[PDB]
Amino acid sequence: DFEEIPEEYL
Amino acid sequence: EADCGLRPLFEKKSLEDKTERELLESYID
Amino acid sequence: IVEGSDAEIGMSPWQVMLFRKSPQELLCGASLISDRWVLTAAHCLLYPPWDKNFTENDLLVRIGKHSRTRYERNIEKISMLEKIYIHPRYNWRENLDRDIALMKLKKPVAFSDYIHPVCLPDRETAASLLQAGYKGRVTGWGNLKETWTANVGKGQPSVLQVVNLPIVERPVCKDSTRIRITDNMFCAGYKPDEGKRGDACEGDSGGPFVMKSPFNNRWYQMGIVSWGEGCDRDGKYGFYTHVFRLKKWIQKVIDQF
Ligand SMILES: C[C@@H]1CNc2c(cccc2S(=O)(=O)N[C@@H](CCCNC(N)=[NH2+])C(=O)N2CC[C@@H](C)C[C@@H]2C(=O)O)C1
Numbered sequence: 001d002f003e004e005i006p007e008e009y010l
Numbered sequence: 011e012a013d014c015g016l017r018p019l020f021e022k023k024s025l026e027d028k029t030e031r032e033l034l035e036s037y038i039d
Numbered sequence: 040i041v042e043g044s045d046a047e048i049g050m051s052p053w054q055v056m057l058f059r060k061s062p063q064e065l066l067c068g069a070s071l072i073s074d075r076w077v078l079t080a081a082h083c084l085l086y087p088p089w090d091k092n093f094t095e096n097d098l099l100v101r102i103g104k105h106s107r108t109r110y111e112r113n114i115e116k117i118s119m120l121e122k123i124y125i126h127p128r129y130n131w132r133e134n135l136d137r138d139i140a141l142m143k144l145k146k147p148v149a150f151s152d153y154i155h156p157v158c159l160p161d162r163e164t165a166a167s168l169l170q171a172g173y174k175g176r177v178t179g180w181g182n183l184k185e186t187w188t189a190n191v192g193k194g195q196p197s198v199l200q201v202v203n204l205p206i207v208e209r210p211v212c213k214d215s216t217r218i219r220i221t222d223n224m225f226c227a228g229y230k231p232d233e234g235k236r237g238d239a240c241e242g243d244s245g246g247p248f249v250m251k252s253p254f255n256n257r258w259y260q261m262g263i264v265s266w267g268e269g270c271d272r273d274g275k276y277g278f279y280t281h282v283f284r285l286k287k288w289i290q291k292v293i294d295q296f
Contacts, residue, residue, distance in 0.1 A: 033203060
């Protein structure tokens, strides 16, 4: 695999 | 009330998808 | 999806992806029934036998996706859960009866060319569309094969996969499993003498089983990817949650008024 999503969600 | 089931790039654009007819014909057998 | 195809862009705008924060991984499929509610299968959030028990804080919801792995900045929308609701009589011990679950988003989502809700059936619709022999459509990002040679390929598809399966006569379903099937289930798939294949598979769970109404030109979600015995086996079929039967519960949970 997955491209990275914004860390605010993680 | 809320509209649904109508795909913005298909139904609404008067276009149908590649295998949609298989669904449809399955009715009129 | 086994023996399916790449879906066209914007082909299932109600298709939702259930993402896991850490580790980051694809949990299941799901659908958008509205501006703030998502409908998935219970067994995607809770399956004790495997110590599976997710909560509102462990997941994410990704709507408007096409590609399985990409972060589609311009088209997709990432939402956080406000509350999860599992059918009180969901039977995870024996047959997964009432395998349904609703999820309430924290903030409403904005509809688009890529994000649109699917409809829920009414008595007449369910009555005339759910008839054996009639075809339905299943979509997901799950395994392409029940099994495969490790490291030599990729069991998962690059983009959303779509397959069209016919509904099977109850008796026929009943005869295919040792499992106790209820009136809350339904089965679909081709028969061995049918000359065609296809099935949902691991990762497709929670996904929607939809149908198209010729008269009103609208899509209706008749079932939910539930369970099965492996993927694409002959003389075996997929079992979907009967959405129509469980509508009152949905209705009760949602409370639009
Ligand atoms: C009453 C079901 C029957 N079978 C199973 C159960 C539990 C775990 C695994 C199996 S399975 O490996 O046979 N098949 C998977 C996947 C089948 C996919 N094929 C299809 N849908 N046509 C299953 O049903 N599952 C449902 C429960 C969940 C925990 C595991 C697994 C899923 O991931 O799909 C109980």
